[PDB]
From a paper:
One remarkable character of negative-strand RNA viruses is that their genomes are enwrapped by the nucleoprotein (N), which results in the formation of helical nucleocapsids. N has two domains, the amino-terminal domain (NTD) and the carboxy-terminal domain (CTD), with a positively charged cleft in between that is suitable for RNA binding. In the presence of RNA, each N can bind 6, 7 or 9 nucleotides and thus can clamp RNA into the cleft, forming a ribonucleoprotein complex (RNP). Here, the Newcastle disease virus (NDV), a member of the genus Avulavirus, family Paramyxoviridae, which is relatively safe for handling, was selected as the model to look at how NDV RNP protects its viral genome and to provide new insights into the development of nucleocapsid-based antivirus therapies.
Different from the reported ring-structure and helical spirals, a novel clam-shaped structure of NDV N with two single-turn spirals packing in a back-to-back manner was identified and determined, corresponding to the extracted nucleocapsid assembly of NDV. Further 3D refinement resolved the clam-shaped structure to 6.4 Å resolution and showed obvious C2 symmetry in the rigid body. The C2 symmetry was then applied to improve the resolution, yielding an overall 4.8 Å resolution of the core structure. Homolog modeling on NDV N, based on the 40% sequence identity of N between NDV and Parainfluenza virus 5 (PIV5), resulted the subunit N model and the model was flexibly docked into the EM density map. The docked model fits the EM density well with only minor modification, and resulted in a reliable initial model of NDV N. In the clam-shaped structure or in the derived double-headed filament, the self-capping interface came from loops (residues 114–120) of vertically adjacent N in the clam-shaped core. Distance analysis of the residues in the loop suggested that hydrogen bonds may exist between two pairs of Glysin119 and Arginine117 residues. The evidence suggests that Loop114–120 has no influence on helical assembly but has a crucial role in clam-shaped structure formation. The C-tail is located inside the clam-shaped structure, and is only accessible from either end by P or other proteins in order to form the N–RNA–RdRp complex for the replication and transcription of the genomic RNA; this finding differs from those of previous reports that have described outside-orientated C-tails.
Residue numbers in the entry: 1 to 18, 26 to 398
RNA sequence: UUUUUU
């Protein structure tokens, strides 16, 4: 016995099902450390940063510089750059920089390079943000001529630079989303932690450009995604770098799916009686559809934004406009968030907003079956807590 | 299509 609604669902299931050809693909130069000297890791990090922040070097190369700023943290970096090589979609090279001598400039290499190339980066060292001051990345001038006597502070500086990056990985879109203040709040609470010094802040202009670079490059984000997957996978007892990554992770995830999760929070997870209504159901049915599509998606699910796949479009807030508006109007009254921006659509319905207001304005109504059948609640207590809400 | 706080 096929029922009409049931076959309605059977129709809405086939549609929601989620080798790819090979195109032209450009080489990405990538740098690889070898050495055990703290001085050498220090110059490697300053160098990869002065590359990353170039005013004149082409794109793939700044990409590679950033890959290196994100790779430099490790000790044994052979296997981590092999894990870089594991991703067959792009194409990366090794360039064993073999270390540099006491003079900062020479890139002394044995394999696969040339001394004319031998003049460009160093030429590119000269690459400088005319807008940026002191002509250096770190805002306190007399910092980079420092002595890393031990490996621990060199690590810690690497951590701070990379974490400045990992913070700026969120709000990843292309327009200049202003997340400087939230970046600053997280820098401040990482100062509450203390793993990052106040002494090593970058220039925020160059940082936002580093962000713009991050999102213009496809595979550096893919590397971020794999970084973050191996971060979420590892437990607590480990090395500090994964702990920074996984700690910042919960701020990276779940991005751009925001109205969808507002609906989850306010619209549904409160199960107010107006949720039950004449029609709002159909969009609820589709809500649990995208739920099933979220769970059986799963392993790349908290990361579609960064991932970039078109399927999020299936996470369109627009088909929910009725529900979506209600859940919002209510959050607008009940919660005091989102009031400082335009978080609204033109495909909205006005009445269900008005009703989210009216329904949220009278908190006498929140009665749940759950606590009722939990505490054997009286009518006396019901009308009592009502008088409380009459405040 | 994207636009909080943690």
């Amino acid at each position: 016995m096929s029922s009409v609604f049931d076959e309605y669902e059977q129709l809405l299931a086939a549609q929601t099902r989620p080798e790819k050809g090979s195109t032209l693909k450009v080489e990405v130069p990538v740098f690889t450390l070898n050495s055990d000297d703290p001085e050498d890791r220090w110059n490697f990090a300053v160098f990869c940063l002065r590359i990353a922040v170039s005013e004149d070097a082409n794109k793939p190369l700044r990409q590679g510089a950033l890959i290196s700023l994100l790779c430099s943290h490790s000790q044994v970096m052979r296997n981590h750059v092999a894990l870089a090589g594991k991703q067959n979609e792009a194409t990366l090279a090794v360039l064993e920089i073999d270390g540099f001598t006491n003079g900062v400039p020479q890139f002394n290499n044995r394999s696969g390079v040339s001394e004319e190339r031998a003049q460009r980066f160093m030429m590119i060292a000269g690459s400088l943000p005319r807008a940026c001051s002191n002509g250096t990345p770190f805002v306190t001038a007399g910092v980079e001529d420092d002595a890393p006597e031990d490996i621990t502070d060199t690590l810690e500086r690497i951590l701070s630079i990379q974490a400045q990056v990992w913070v700026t990985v969120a709000k990843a879109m292309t327009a200049y989303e202003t997340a400087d203040e939230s970046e600053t709040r997280r820098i401040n609470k990482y100062m509450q932690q203390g793993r990052v010094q106040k002494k090593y802040i970058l220039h925020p202009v160059c940082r936002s450009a580093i962000q713009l670079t991050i999102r213009q490059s496809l595979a550096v984000r893919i590397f971020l995604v794999s970084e973050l997957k191996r971060g979420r996978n590892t437990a607590g007892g480990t090395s500090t770098y994964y702990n920074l990554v996984g700690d910042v992770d919960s701020y990276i995830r779940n991005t751009g799916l925001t109205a969808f999760f507002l609906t989850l929070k306010y619209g549904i997870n409160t199960k107010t009686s107006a949720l039950a209504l004449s029609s709002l159901s159909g969009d609820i049915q589709k809500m649990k559809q995208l739920m099933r599509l979220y769970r059986m998606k799963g392993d790349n699910a908290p990361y579609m934004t960064l991932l970039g796949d078109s399927d999020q479009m299936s996470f369109a807030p627009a088909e929910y406009a009725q529900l979506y508006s209600f859940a919002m109007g209510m959050a607008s009254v009940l919660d005091k968030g989102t009031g400082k921006y335009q978080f609204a659509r033109d495909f909205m319905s006005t009445s269900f907003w008005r009703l989210g207001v009216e329904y949220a304005q009278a908190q006498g109504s929140s009665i749940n079956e759950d606590m009722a059948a939990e505490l054997k609640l009286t009518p006396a207590a019901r009308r009592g807590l009502a008088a409380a809400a009459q405040r």
